[PDB]
Design a protein around this ligand. Structure first.
Ligand SMILES: CCCCCCCCO[C@@H]1O[C@H](CO)[C@@H](O)[C@H](O)[C@H]1O
Ligand SMILES: CCCCCCCCO[C@@H]1O[C@H](CO)[C@@H](O)[C@H](O)[C@H]1O
Ligand SMILES: CCCCCCCCO[C@@H]1O[C@H](CO)[C@@H](O)[C@H](O)[C@H]1O
Ligand SMILES: CCCCCCCCO[C@@H]1O[C@H](CO)[C@@H](O)[C@H](O)[C@H]1O
Ligand SMILES: CCCCCCCCO[C@@H]1O[C@H](CO)[C@@H](O)[C@H](O)[C@H]1O
Ligand SMILES: CCCCCCCCO[C@@H]1O[C@H](CO)[C@@H](O)[C@H](O)[C@H]1O
Ligand SMILES: CCCCCCCCO[C@@H]1O[C@H](CO)[C@@H](O)[C@H](O)[C@H]1O
Ligand SMILES: CCCCCCCCO[C@@H]1O[C@H](CO)[C@@H](O)[C@H](O)[C@H]1O
Ligand SMILES: CCCCCCCCO[C@@H]1O[C@H](CO)[C@@H](O)[C@H](O)[C@H]1O
Ligand SMILES: CCCCCCCCO[C@@H]1O[C@H](CO)[C@@H](O)[C@H](O)[C@H]1O
Ligand code: MET
Ligand code: MET
Ligand code: NA
Ligand code: NA
Ligand code: NA
Ligand code: NA
Lengths: 509, 509
């Protein structure tokens, strides 16, 4: 089995797993929609009670499985719980990352397409004060790129450029993955992460210089870091905060587990896990938090910025920020730097989300790395046509896999590891080889607090939020639901085939 | 490997493979739309130049492959042509029958649902002369069953009864298939075919007694068997005739090949093949041709009958015929007999179209028959939800697989067998063990005439018919296209996995 070559490489790869579009696109919107500073208390609390403990659990499960030649959850769940149902539950650890890959790589490709166009100056040009005369050209720019519907049909019409750029993006992902763990992902991480940090810091500095009749970037920071204890009672904010924690730390995606499966059996995971998690949070709250929101508030004031944030998930990052930059000298190049940053952030995350499928094909079906990477790319590429052409298909996948799925799977993996496998055995497995030990208190958090926190969260979520979605959606949501259910059935069949190959193999040995 | 137990069983199973919904539903509509007697000249000619020769070729390929433990085209094509491209072309021999199964079993389930409702007298009751006051209740009956759209959305809403009946239908197919070739399909064929023949003969007799102010059943027969040489020039009629020949004989579906793979290496296929083909044609032109058309013409006259035939593919069989029967004493029970006949016709054909997937899983992935049958049923059942809920999805699948696909695959299999593998080797393989020899003239038909006939047909088809369809369709056709393209990719992946299992297997032996 492959192993990470160096401790630094392991850390930067894991940090690259985490630090993604979620830090720079998702976090600012989530925080802005939820009162800014009012979002941060629940967010910090979720990091401590969910983010940290689950991170350690996934590193431990991955390392544990890797020692026996397994990196994905169908096998790993079965090692922890010798029951047919463990294998079936384990399928979600292949299904979630596959579905997420299907829309995440597409969005990643947009950032590359925008970077290219901004670099070469093929961008819109607003009419030099109206907040709409400047924004409209950038809205139309995004709409033409991805092909937003102009009529009644729920169909998207992406530009030829966007389509070719997606192909290029897939090629770049494959070029890294095909080289494997140490020579591919690890080597790229050592180049991408420092680049990512430098670009982000530069952008923060530039944004911090923004001042208009409507305010300064300082006003944006104050909105984000001023608590509102009257929101600590709103369940919606807690759900948002926990959802962001999962998404941001790559928890429940099967991605941390698979990376950790390449950590040597004896190697520390306590300090490494904590370090990766902490690096992500710094990139999120300090870097991601200090770019988009302050820029928007500086130019539009808080009320308008919040309204922009609620407007859509991509409005702030693909329309508003570049429009704001365009009002400044060298703003087109600043736009390039922003999208280049997003691309490297996306890329280091997308190689992580496709590795579980690759590991399963290698580990369980005994495919060569070459074949495993290429077939994985093929399935993602083919499937992405749904997200490229059917309006709101992206939203549907992001809901079932990237939102509900990850939280559900997080609770599942914790129950299996800390309840079925054995709390004391799990505790011992986590700490084994630790450069530091996990604080004793976290034993009771993991065993009692985290599961109960998530269980209540999911129930409240399910009672007062989900029914609206099932009842109040356009019929086309069923196209995406049908397809991703088929994907689950497909992966279940592959797990079945893996069992049969193993049985026939043992009969020969 | 399993083998057919008796020669009679083999013949009735193969006859059951062929004699299906195509004889009793498809043939009458095709003949009626194309001038009746004007359809029959091209039809007879296609039977001689295409139907017969291709039947022998498929029996031969199946028997040839079966002798080496292979029953499906990915392997068999490779045996005949040691080239990676042979395996890929061979995938169509799994893809076509899978796609056809996905809509064919659903339609088959309707005939069971109708049989049940007609048996128990839960049927509509027209107002005792208006040709519309009688037909409307039966149209509404079908529309409520399958759930035809009442608004603008291209969505179907099948009754709960129709859904449960589809489940039952799948169960019945599985119950036969799970028992295998000799104890399952062969044993059922010996019961179903005689029953089928008796029901059909009875129905023909009953229809032959129909006489109204508008005409007699005799008028229907005259319309069907009166030549119109002025149509021998119309290409459309030839395309229709050849398409019906393929569909009716189960040619290009991979189904005849797979059944023949269970024929012993030395056993005759010349007389057996010819006998199965001839039995089908008798059931089609004598039985199928003498039920629906004469009944409709008797009650409505020719012009109206033809108009009904053009109305839809299911209007004649599910609406018009039962409505006509309802005007006669014991007509509800006659309706039951009709739908019972259709069901047995459908059932013996659907077990044939699912056996290729079963054989591939058994032969190439080494699954047990139990697992192979159940996974096949699961894929068909899941996929059928597309045909059940998306308006016109059925039409799209029937076009790509059941119409274009089978003719394309027929030309492919002939080219591979008679051109690449070797005309003389193919000729020798067909005749080997023959109780009779194939007439010498058919060597030149197979090698030169059949391929050229099909090639010209396909080109003319492609030039003057296909473009309208690609350009003039609702956007929802892409949902079905996307899905069945995914099915092809899925099956291609399975063939790839089969190669890898074989390679690893040989390395051990
Ligand atoms: C691998 C699955 C392929 C299914 C059909 C995909 C057809 C893609 O079609 C392409 O889409 C682009 C984006 O709209 C257009 O710019 C191109 O003109 C068009 O050829
Ligand atoms: C960075 C590598 C990808 C480049 C893909 C370019 C695809 C060509 O895109 C074409 O560009 C033309 C000129 O701008 C436009 O007028 C056309 O509408 C567009 O189809
Ligand atoms: C479920 C996803 C299916 C995607 C099917 C894509 C089929 C592409 O089809 C092509 O797309 C082009 C761009 O939209 C259009 O300009 C063409 O008219 C159309 O033929
Ligand atoms: C919500 C969970 C927050 C946990 C924060 C734990 C901070 C560390 O807490 C410390 O842990 C050490 C090791 O067990 C102990 O020796 C110390 O007494 C204790 O203060
Ligand atoms: C492609 C086949 C789609 C057929 C299924 C569509 C059935 C219509 O069901 C629709 O489902 C939506 C989502 O749950 C709901 O919001 C709507 O209220 C409901 O009418
Ligand atoms: C195996 C794939 C399942 C996908 C969702 C299928 C849901 C079927 O839904 C069922 O459809 C029937 C027919 O309209 C209705 O009569 C039933 O009330 C309904 O529960
Ligand atoms: C033959 C075995 C399948 C029988 C399935 C019956 C499913 C029940 O079907 C129900 O029947 C009721 C009474 O007719 C109707 O009023 C309901 O609308 C219908 O849902
Ligand atoms: C591509 C095929 C997807 C099929 C999805 C079926 C989802 C079933 O969904 C259910 O269907 C019932 C009958 O239509 C409706 O009455 C319900 O409102 C709907 O929720
Ligand atoms: C379009 C193809 C129609 C073929 C019909 C062939 C009918 C049989 O034709 C016969 O075949 C025998 C065996 O070769 C010969 O000995 C006879 O002389 C010949 O008449
Ligand atoms: C589910 C995703 C569907 C997106 C693809 C729809 C693109 C619209 O393309 C449509 O295709 C039809 C069939 O070729 C043609 O008849 C129409 O002229 C064309 O507009
Ligand atoms: C695509 S890996 C999961 C998401 C990633 N952690 C991000 O924040 O973007
Ligand atoms: C479903 S097997 C192919 C069709 C069959 N020969 C029929 O006529 O119905
Ligand atoms: Na992150
Ligand atoms: Na990343
Ligand atoms: Na037939
Ligand atoms: Na049949």
């Amino acid at each position: 089995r492959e192993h990470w070559a160096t401790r630094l490489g392991l850390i930067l790869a894991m940090a690259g797993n985490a630090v993604g579009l979620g830090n720079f696109l998702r976090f600012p919107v989530q925080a802005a929609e939820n009162g800014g500073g009012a979002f941060m208390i629940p967010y910090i609390i979720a990091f401590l009670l969910v983010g940290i403990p689950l991170m350690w659990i996934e590193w431990a499960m991955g390392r544990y499985g890797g020692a026996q030649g397994h990196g994905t959850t169908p096998a790993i769940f079965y090692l922890l719980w010798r029951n047919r149902f463990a294998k079936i539950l384990g399928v979600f650890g292949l299904w979630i990352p596959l579905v997420v890959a299907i829309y995440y790589v597409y969005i990643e490709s947009w950032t590359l397409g925008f970077a290219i166009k901004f670099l070469v100056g093929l961008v819109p040009e607003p009419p030099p004060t109206d907040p709409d005369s400047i924004l409209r050209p950038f809205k139309e720019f995004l709409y033409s790129y991805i092909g937003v519907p102009k009529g009644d049909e729920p169909i998207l019409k992406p530009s030829l450029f966007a389509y070719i750029v997606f192909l290029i993006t897939m090629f770049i992902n494959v070029s890294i993955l095909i080289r494997g763990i140490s020579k591919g992902i690890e080597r790229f991480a050592k180049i991408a992460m420092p680049t990512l940090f430098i670009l982000a810091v530069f952008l923060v500095i530039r944004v911090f210089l923004l001042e208009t009749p409507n305010g300064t970037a300082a006003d944006g920071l104050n909105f984000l870091w001023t608590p509102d204890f009257e929101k600590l009672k709103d369940p919606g904010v807690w759900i948002a905060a926990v959802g962001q924690i999962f998404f941001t730390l790559s928890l429940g995606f099967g991605a941390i587990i698979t990376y950790a499966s390449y950590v040597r059996k004896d190697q520390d995971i306590v300090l490494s896990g904590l370090t990766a998690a902490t690096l992500n949070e710094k990139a999120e709250v300090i870097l991601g938090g200090s770019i988009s929101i302050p820029a928007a508030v500086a130019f539009f004031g808080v009320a308008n910025a919040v309204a922009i944030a609620k407007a859509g998930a991509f409005n702030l990052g693909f329309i508003t920020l570049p429009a704001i930059f365009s009002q400044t000298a060298g703003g087109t190049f600043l736009g390039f730097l922003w999208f280049f940053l997003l691309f490297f952030a996306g890329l280091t995350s997308s190689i992580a989300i496709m590795q579980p499928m690759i590991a399963f094909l290698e580990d369980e079906l005994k495919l060569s790395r070459k074949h495993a990477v290429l077939w994985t790319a093929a399935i993602v590429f083919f499937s992405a046509h749904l997200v490229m052409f059917l309006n709101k298909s992206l939203d549907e996948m992001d809901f079932w896999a990237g939102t509900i799925g990850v939280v559900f799977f997080g609770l599942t993996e914790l129950i299996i590891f800390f309840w079925i496998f054995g709390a004391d055995k799990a505790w011992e497995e986590i700490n084994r080889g630790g450069i530091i030990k996990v604080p004793r208190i976290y034993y009771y958090v993991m065993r009692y607090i985290t599961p109960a926190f998530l269980a209540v969260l999911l129930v409240v979520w399910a009672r007062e939020y989900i029914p609206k979605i099932m009842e109040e959606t356009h019929w086309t949501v069923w196209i995406t639901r049908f397809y991703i259910i088929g994907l689950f059935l497909f992966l279940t069949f592959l797990v079945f085939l893996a069992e049969r190959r193993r049985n026939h193999e043992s009969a020969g040995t």
